[PDB]
Amino acid sequence: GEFLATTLERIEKNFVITDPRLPDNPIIFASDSFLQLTEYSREEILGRNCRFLQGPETDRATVRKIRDAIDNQTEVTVQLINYTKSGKKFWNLFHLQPMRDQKGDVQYFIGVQLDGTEHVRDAAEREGVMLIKKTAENIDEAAKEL
Ligand SMILES: *[C@@]12=NC3=[C]C([C])=C([C])[C]=C3N([C][C]([O])[C]([O])[C]([O])[C]OP([O])([O])=O)C1=NC(=O)[N]C2=O
């Protein structure tokens, strides 16, 4: 269909990239795995703020932690309930970090989502955060020259 995946978006990891220069910090790249998890097509996601994944059981306190991170241009790692297109719930161990250019200005934000069936703690939380941070570092490389 529309918006065939770029090579970046075929990286076998769940992430999105947003452009904070664009009204409402919208998604501009979304990986195939993100599409698969969320049940949206790429055309349905692009140019939208990622908050469309939130729903009734999403903890708004947690959403404010993300808002504040973006506002302060800093990373955050949180867990929150998200919803697919068809309204199926999933937990999202979510890591955000800015991507900076060669003058240290924030160019994009990188978001990595690890979907799970439950809030994780201890070993599962640690291994999850290990995974999403390593992924974010990989994408910071991948995205640098877009
Ligand atoms: C979404 N992932 C995600 C990825 C990036 C790179 C960015 C910048 C944001 C997200 N969001 C958070 C959302 O877009 C928004 O920043 C928050 O809702 C806070 O702002 P508001 O204006 O709504 O108070 C993500 N949100 C999700 O729920 N799930 C993700 O995967």
CA 68 – CA 3 distance, rounded (Å): 31
Of the candidates 104, 98, 107, 106, the residue with the CA atom closest to the CA atom of residue 137: 98
| Distance in angstroms (rounded) separating the CA atoms of residues 57 and 48 | 21
Ligand 1 contact via 50 beta carbon (within 6 Å): yes
**Residue 54: both structure tokens together:** 């939130």
Instruction: Specify the residue with its C-alpha closest to ligand 1, atom 21.
Output: 67
Non-local (6+) Cβ contacts of 86 within 8 A are 39
Report the C-alpha gap between 56 and 71 in whole angstroms.
24
Q: Phi and psi (nearest 5°) for 14?
A: -90, 110
Query: Structure solved using which method?
Result: X-ray
**C-alpha count within 13 angstroms, C-beta hemisphere, residue 137:** 6
**Beta carbon of 72 within 6 Å of any ligand 1 atom:** no
3-state secondary structure of 52: helix
Domains defined along the chain, listed by start: 1-146 (3.30.450.20)
Strand partners, 93: 79, 114
